Amino acid sequence: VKEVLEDFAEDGEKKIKLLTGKRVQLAEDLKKVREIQEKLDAFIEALHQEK
Amino acid sequence: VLQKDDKGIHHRKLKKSLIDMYSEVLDVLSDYDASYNTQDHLPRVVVVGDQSAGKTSVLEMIAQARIFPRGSGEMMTRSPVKVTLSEGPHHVALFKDSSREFDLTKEEDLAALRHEIELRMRKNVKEGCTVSPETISLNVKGPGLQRMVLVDLPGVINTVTSGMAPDTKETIFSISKAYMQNPNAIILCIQDGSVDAERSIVTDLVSQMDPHGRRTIFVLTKVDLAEKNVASPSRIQQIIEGKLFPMKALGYFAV
Amino acid sequence: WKMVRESVEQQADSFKATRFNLETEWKNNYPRLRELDRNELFEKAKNEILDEVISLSQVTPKHWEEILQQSLWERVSTHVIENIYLPAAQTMNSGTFNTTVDIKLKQWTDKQLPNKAVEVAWETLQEEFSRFMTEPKGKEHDDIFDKLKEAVK
Amino acid sequence: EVISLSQVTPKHWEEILQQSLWERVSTHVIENIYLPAAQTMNSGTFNTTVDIKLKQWTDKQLPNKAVEVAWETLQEEFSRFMTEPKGKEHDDIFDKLKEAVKEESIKRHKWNDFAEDSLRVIQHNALEDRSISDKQQWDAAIYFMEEALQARLKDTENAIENMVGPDWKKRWLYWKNRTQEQCVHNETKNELEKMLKCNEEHPAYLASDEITTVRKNLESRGVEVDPSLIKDTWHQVYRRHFLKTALNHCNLCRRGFYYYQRHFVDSELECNDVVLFWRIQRMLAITANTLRQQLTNTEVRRLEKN
Amino acid sequence: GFYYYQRHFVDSELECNDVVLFWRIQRMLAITANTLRQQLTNTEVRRLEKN
Ligand SMILES: Nc1nc2c(ncn2[C@@H]2O[C@H](COP(=O)(O)OP(=O)(O)O)[C@@H](O)[C@H]2O)c(=O)[nH]1
Ligand code: ALF
Ligand SMILES: [K+]
Ligand SMILES: [Mg+2]
């Protein structure tokens, strides 16, 4: 069981398929929206620095 | 401190601080959002048109290096190819995720860029069709470049021949509308200049997605055929003036 | 770049709306839900699996032996009754009855019985392992770990 | 005699193979498939849960056990034909050769190695088709399901009586008493029975708070119980509770539907367990026929040849 | 009668299948109508207002 858990930990694809609980996907969407928001905030701040 | 200097203003705030970071914003949003419904605010330098040979040439006019797939008698641009343009040490380039630096003054590195692009296109496109929306990304620098992000999109066919899957034209239109439907995008229509203005395949699309002439710029390829009268000079003058467009247009330039 | 400065900034409104909607769904239904991405859920399921497997490893011998005896008896009762006991019962000489029974039992031991015993032990271990790994027979279970628990099982 | 064995009617093969094989797998479905699936009130999940297990179980175990039963079943009749006495008349002088011949013949009796592949397709189709439009199909399935459940109920009840010992009826009738463990089990049973008395729908899984609650309820009467004793007590009593409920569910399934005016009453009596049982009964019946066809077409001839 | 109760352990004379068909038709129509209403109020009605 421990070896299999290690293999799943290393196996990204099997984790992707297994972890499709729709809450993992909601968390991923929230995190990605936050990351794009941070990138957008930095980008907009730089734009205002350009004016 | 080194990250602050390199990832922010390394003496080039406009060209460096937020041009590559703009490309990162686009890449991260495209990673999160496969669709472009959320990319309306992010403009792009979009090149669209027919299978005209000058589609590669205009992109090398803006990205002033012979870095794009070149070919004859075929639509080489299978999939979108993104290039980030900015100033820097002359004739230097990068290929995303290839861990390789390219010298744009030597044929070997330009060929390497084109071959990597072709391989990524051949992996984006599945058997039975010629185009795929999946993107390819470059970072090109040089004194002749502006702070611009370019995308090299497949030419419109509207018809399928030679055993090609019938879905190809709809796939092409979807790939090109992903950007042409972007309110903030800039559309460059590549017009083959070997035919009369009456034959323009992409005019009807921008005339609906950009009827106000706020994004679409038409560029005439093979301008030497106006000198030779192979293409009607009168219609060429009228397209220069813009009398032949059933729409408003952002501008017009010669290729 | 003019279009950039004009339009890119307002993309924050839709980003905030999306984050608000996701966090609203969480607060209403998943107040314990966090950035439960490919790593966090996997780790929690892994730890639960290891803990339940250890609990299995700690099962008392009494339960083990009782279930093993019951299962093997279920498997061998009718074999004994039909192939050894009843055929032997045809004789009125209990000594030849016992002789035949012992011979058949020795042959069955040599060829079949220990293989059925090992089958019983292995399948009983599988059954207890599944009971620990699979959904507990309750209402509190969160199925979100079922994919990994079953795949690992 | 081996030719006479080849004269055994399919009727005997199909019945013997079906009865023997089901008995071998009768508890696996009940304990590992049905009962845990019965822990949810969602009949769709119940049927969804079992079908996934059955198909996986079908691929890995069912055709391998089915052939083994058929391989043994043929040898069981062969031995009876071979060396069984003709009542009180028997030439035991020949038994050494007969068994010696059998051992060599069974060693060379290699069952068709592809029989399992046909059974997998058959079993997948037998399970895939869950449409029971016939009352007779319903009637047969429920009565046999009751027997399996009644067997489990008595198996649990007999284990319980040992766990708890005789009741006052036998303690005073036969001058018996309870061991201190049995005394604990009876009171541990009583508290669990009271809990189920109210929470009839209590899930099989017990919370440690229930374990603590029982302990304090028993400690409050001078009875100190290890949690492990309660859990072991809980499992047997719960099945007795559940199984009686299932049989009462079965009783209403047959009786309630039997009354004509009740067929337009949409009560919560989805006898999905009869659907599961019926398919298996059919699935094994088809499996036995496939085994019987292989048994009489290929395997018995190989036995005769060997 | 009813879908399930007409079949199991009963001498039903009914064998009703039209109810399931038209009930599924009702559900499909309701789902289609709700999807259309969502599409309308999200995109199409405001598109018409903009036009
Ligand atoms: N005569 C003429 N030839 C051109 C022009 N533009 C491009 N070509 C030639 O045609 C090739 C076009 O490249 P190609 O791969 O077909 O571009 P793509 O189809 O858009 O991917 C170039 O290598 C040029 O040699 C033009 O305006 N006039
Ligand atoms: F010829 Al192309 F896009 F490849 F116009
Ligand atoms: K071309
Ligand atoms: Mg091209």
From Swiss-Prot, chain E:
Residue segments, region Stalk region: 16-51
Top-level taxon in the UniProt lineage: Eukaryota
Subcellular compartments: Mitochondrion intermembrane space
Role summary: Constitutes the soluble short form (S-OPA1) generated by cleavage by OMA1, which plays a central role in mitochondrial inner membrane fusion and cristae morphology. The transmembrane long form (L-OPA1) and the S-OPA1 form higher-order helical assemblies that coordinate the fusion of mitochondrial inner membranes. Inner membrane-anchored L-OPA1 molecules initiate membrane remodeling by recruiting soluble S-OPA1 to rapidly polymerize into a flexible cylindrical scaffold encaging the mitochondrial inner membrane.
UniProt name for this protein: Dynamin-like GTPase OPA1, short form
Organism: Homo sapiens (Human)
Gene assigned in the entry: OPA1
Whole-protein coverage range: 859 to 909 of 960
